[PDB]
Structure 1
């Protein structure tokens, strides 16, 4: 517990309408930007960590549409 909240580390188990917010946080959106800019392989150690981070982040759901779309769209404009 960090001041009451359980962290998601691998040692732990798990009329105008209002202006809406994106369903990702800005830490999560910054994480997505860093992982995608590391996974385009400018540096190899950066890639390898980003690949391990993708391979074992438990909270990588609810970001997965944006990763699948980045993959799919990328291969089609990368061929």
Structure 2
């Protein structure tokens, strides 16, 4: 008996979004930071 291969609780769009927002929030470019900061400030689905 093998338990089923589980899936991460984030989608790959959500995981890609997390990667883009974190790589923008380390501030290589300032306009990228500022949008990523506004995206953090008003994304409704940023829970989970």
Give the TM-score of the pair, scaled to structure 1: 0.61
Q: Which digits, 9 at most, give the CA deviation of each residue in 1:34-54, with x for residues without a partner?
A: 000000000000000000000
Q: Whose RCO is larger (CA < 8 A, sep 6+)?
A: 1
Q: Which runs of 4+ in 1 moved over 2 A?
A: none
Larger CA Rg, structure 1 vs 2: 1
Write the distance in 2 (CA, Å) between the matches of 1:61 and 1:51: 15
**Structure 2 residue runs without a partner (length 5+):** none
Give the paired residue count: 48
Structure 1 unaligned blocks of 5 or more: 1-14, 63-79
What TM-score do you get using the length of structure 2 for normalisation? 1.00
